[PDB]
């Protein structure tokens, strides 16, 4: 019967929650209170990247930690030389309402997608000189919200449809599709071993997926509204969430609990972009009150406020080297921030 | 300073010249967003305008009196309008289309309009209503078989407002219902609206050719009122 089926479901959920809370003697706060809190970190804008006509929704550093790519509502991708603020390429898009972008690890490709349910792959190292589209991925049914290359021939997408898919650019098929969510999947992040990834799906629930097998290996439920951002710790055994309830939370793929709740009564609007630092000690989060509040991963406080934008920040990424950090906002400006000593 | 300073200058400033060339085009075209239900003319209206000037957005562009408009019909999307309506702020106006023939599928149409109007990211976006399928309403309520008061009992003690504009050769016993369904939406709009954005109802039926002109005039009014509120005179 349906009622009995829902019964066992409920008791399985209870067996999930009690087992999860069984192994929860301590919190990061207890183990980090004795640890020395980090000082008040103070970044400063070291150069500004003017040129976008309208709002900015995405950015992503290259693997050289010097090139950059960013997406805008006017429908352009711009590749900056972040050292000299030079412009390398200006790629006009077919659809203006792009919502994400990604830069291939080899540096040969960039990807972008948006409200049109298409993921576009661009070729940067063309023998003919210009930048051309190399592939279109049209299997999705909802709007596309994030893209992440695995290599030159494998990309993973997350759409407004309650689905994540694994593509292969050579053929354009949908080798593996990931289902189980119930809301719009918003963010995405690859583990630093190219074997698992996570996705927040507008239902306060995040999941861990297996790029090879295909089934949802693990699911977390600790928020209370739409989950807007997600990112792996540099370890590969953790990930932080940012949601519309103005709270960030840190999970762990082998603990099945949220660890720290990143709350502040002064902060009232929801998170929009989350990224970590190379050491994993500085959790940087974009917000909607026009600042990029910088939190400490372990000590659960605010050790820095990167407020230099006029409109709402929307994207936030760090270099693979770790020497800088960039922020894009709805003011059409992209600022690379760095410290000074 | 090196001979490879062409990348430093003679490439980046050519790109910048192209970008500032495109900026003039961008900040000269008004973007419009079209919303509606499945049983309405939101497909017919857009194609009719297009005729004479698993995909996602169905782009549509047209101009009236040397002013360019980019209307974005949103296509194959899920039922929720929650998290992709944020991208459509700072457009000139939202074009909401309602079916008037149905009455069963009207209460949730008002609910959807209320949801759009009270959205947090659209508090500065004026809405343009097209109470479409009105020829069907005219030919239907004349052969009276479904009573409006069954779904809306307040229609009973309703009086046609003095500022009515009935078309020539029109039964006055359709106009009360017309303005009833209109001012239901209007009273939903006025409540909790502090002048930053207004509601602009219109009466199109199926094939009114003067829809581009209506959108043009409404956009002019929207811009004029926005400035007159900035230029504190209104």
């Amino acid at each position, epitope marked *: 019967e349906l009622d009995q089926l829902r019964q066992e479901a409920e008791q399985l959920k209870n067996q999930i929650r009690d087992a999860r809370k069984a192994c929860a003697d301590a919190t990061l706060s207890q183990i980090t209170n004795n640890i020395d809190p980090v000082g008040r970190i103070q970044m400063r804008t070291r150069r500004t990247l003017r040129g976008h006509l309208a709002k900015i929704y995405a950015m992503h550093w290259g693997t050289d930690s010097r*090139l950059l790519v960013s997406a805008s509502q006017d429908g352009k991708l711009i590749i900056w030389d972040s050292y000299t603020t030079n412009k*390398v390429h200006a790629i006009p898009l077919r659809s203006s309402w792009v919502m994400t972008c990604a830069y291939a690890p080899s540096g040969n490709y960039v990807a972008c997608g948006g409200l049109d349910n298409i993921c576009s792959i661009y070729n940067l190292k063309t023998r003919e*000189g*210009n930048v051309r589209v190399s592939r279109e991925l049209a299997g999705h049914t909802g709007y596309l919200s994030c893209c992440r290359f695995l290599d030159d021939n494998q990309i993973v997408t997350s759409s407004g449809d309650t689905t994540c898919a694994l593509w292969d650019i050579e053929t354009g098929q949908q080798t593996t599709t990931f289902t189980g969510h119930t809301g719009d999947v918003m963010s995405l992040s690859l583990a630093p071993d190219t074997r698992l990834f996570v996705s927040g799906a507008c239902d306060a629930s995040a999941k861990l997926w297996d790029v090879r097998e295909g089934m949802c290996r693990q699911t977390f439920t600790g928020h209370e509204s739409d989950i807007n951002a997600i990112c792996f710790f540099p370890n590969g055994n953790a990930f932080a969430t940012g949601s519309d309830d103005a709270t960030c939370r840190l999970f762990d793929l082998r603990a099945d609990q949220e660890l720290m709740t990143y709350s502040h009564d002064n902060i009232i609007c929801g998170i929009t972009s989350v990224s970590f630092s190379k050491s994993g000690r500085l959790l940087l989060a974009g917000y909607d009150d026009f600042n990029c509040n910088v939190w400490d991963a372990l000590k659960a406080d605010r050790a820095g406020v990167l407020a230099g934008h006029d409109n709402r920040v929307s994207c936030l990424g760090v270099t693979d080297d770790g020497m800088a950090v960039a922020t894009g906002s709805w003011d059409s400006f992209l600022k690379i921030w760095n410290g000074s000593s | *300073l090196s001979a490879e300073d062409k990348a430093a200058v003679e490439r980046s400033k050519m790109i910048e010249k192209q970008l500032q060339k495109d900026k003039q085009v961008y900040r000269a075209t008004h973007r419009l967003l079209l919303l509606g239900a499945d049983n309405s003319g939101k497909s017919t209206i857009v194609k009719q305008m297009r005729i004479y000037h698993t995909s996602g957005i169905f782009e549509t562009k047209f101009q009236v009196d040397k002013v360019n408009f980019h209307m974005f019909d949103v296509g194959a999307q899920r039922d929720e309008r929650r998290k992709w309506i944020q991208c459509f702020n700072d457009v000139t106006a939202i074009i909401f289309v309602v079916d008037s023939s149905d009455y069963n599928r009207l209460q949730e149409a008002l609910n959807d309009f209320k949801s759009i109007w009270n959205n947090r990211w659209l508090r500065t976006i004026s809405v343009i209503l097209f109470l479409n399928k009105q020829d069907l309403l005219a030919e239907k309520v004349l052969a009276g078989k479904s009573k409006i008061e069954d779904y809306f009992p307040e229609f009973a003690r309703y009086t046609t407002p003095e500022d009515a504009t009935p078309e020539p050769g029109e039964d006055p016993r359709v106009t009360r219902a017309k303005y009833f369904i209109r001012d239901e939406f209007l009273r939903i709009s006025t409540a909790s609206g502090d002048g930053r954005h207004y509601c602009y109802p219109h009466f199109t039926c199926s094939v009114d050719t003067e829809n581009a002109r209506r959108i043009f005039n409404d956009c002019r009014d929207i811009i004029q009122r926005m400035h007159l509120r900035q230029y504190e005179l209104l």
Partner: single-chain antibody
Amino acid sequence: VQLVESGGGLVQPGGSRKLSCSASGFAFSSFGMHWVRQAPEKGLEWVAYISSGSGTIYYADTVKGRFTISRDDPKNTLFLQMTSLRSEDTAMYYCVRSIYYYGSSPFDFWGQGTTLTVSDIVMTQATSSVPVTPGESVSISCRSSKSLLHSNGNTYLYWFLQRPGQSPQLLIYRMSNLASGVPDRFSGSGSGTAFTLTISRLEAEDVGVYYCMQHLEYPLTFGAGTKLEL
């Protein structure tokens, strides 16, 4: 990607000619354009340069007055106007594309070049000829005058191989970066004033003459050349 030249031929001294480069198969308007000449048995010598958008134009100090360069993007053709040909202008003029951005490979593609007959940094290539057989390794030397290593980190030394009956072809740009269609046998190195090119295993398609270019300033000079024989 294909450049073909025209406008060459015998010239009575005191006349003038209008050399042209006709590009095809690439975004010509995004590429800078050079001209390089070569005496019938000497090394190469830079001629002129015009940038993308015609904003920047240089010339060789030898003939900076008589010559004049010009491009025309819509027809994807490049022009060289030259007047009052001196006695020494007998050479094999080449047309070279070069796009400059972070990570690009300037001088990557060389045209087939045209012929003509009329009736301060320098590099010295120590060796003139090296006998060789297939199989072993070869290191070709080339020294300079100033230090090519710039502050930003680049070095601006180039390595083009020209086969006995073919056009020059880039091997290693900026002293360490290998080109697109070149096998990974080749490798470059050097001090910063004296440089060397290294080849692991020779084949039948590695003989010819090797040339080393500097690009630190505008007069991109050449070495005399090293020619390998079997």
